[PDB]
């Protein structure tokens, strides 16, 4: 009963650090997930009209604070946003250990000659877009941003499964689906939500 039973039963890919994002092998450079993050987030807070000089922007409220650097009526823009990043990506394939901020990736193992995302890869990368930074393994992911009981959970929240939220991670879209890089072989879909393995709480990174 810890598990969702539908999907491999073991952690979910666990990528350390900052891991680079871009590579450009012509002009000869690289930069990483935080370094893209940070640049979309600069970018959101700008289209906000709300960018100041002091913003790196990371905009990751403290773990556990409901206040964070999005203002909350600017909440629900930065959520659909994440979503739509997140929605245009349906049908990229699934890769174990795939993505990064600036979109699928080469995985690792099983998946490292497979270009797409796995659960964790996407979500990072759907959020990254308003400057939201996420570690790249799901129960890393499962420790930041502030808990909201399941039953409660809302658009934008997002939604962990097996010990610690380390089986697989997704968000949710509403009316009962979610968005997902759910197993090998799979593309990036909308799918019905599961509760088998849920942890008890969602995730809410953005205030609204």
Aim: aromatic share 8%; charged share 15%.
């Amino acid at each position: 009963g810890l598990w969702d039973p539908t999907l491999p039963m073991i952690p979910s890919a666990n990528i350390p650090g900052d891991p680079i994002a871009v590579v450009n092998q012509v002009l000869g450079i690289s930069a990483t997930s935080a370094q893209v993050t940070a640049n979309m987030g600069r970018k959101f807070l700008e289209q906000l009209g709300i960018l100041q000089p002091t913003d790196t922007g990371i905009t990751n409220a403290p773990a556990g604070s409901a206040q964070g650097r999005i203002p909350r009526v600017y909440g629900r823009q930065a959520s659909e946003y994440v979503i739509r990043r997140g929605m245009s990506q349906i049908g990229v394939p699934y890769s174990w250990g795939g993505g990064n901020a600036a979109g699928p990736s080469k995985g690792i193992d099983s998946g490292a000659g497979t270009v797409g995302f796995d659960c964790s890869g996407l979500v990072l990368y759907s959020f990254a877009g308003v400057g939201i930074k996420l570690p790249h393994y799901s129960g890393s992911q499962y420790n930041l941003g502030r808990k909201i009981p399941s039953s409660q959970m809302r658009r934008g929240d997002v939604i962990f499964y097996g010990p610690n939220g380390s089986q697989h991670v997704t968000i949710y879209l509403g009316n009962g689906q979610m968005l997902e890089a759910p197993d090998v072989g799979l593309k990036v879909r909308v799918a019905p939500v599961r509760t088998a393995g849920m942890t008890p709480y969602v995730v809410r990174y953005i205030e609204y």
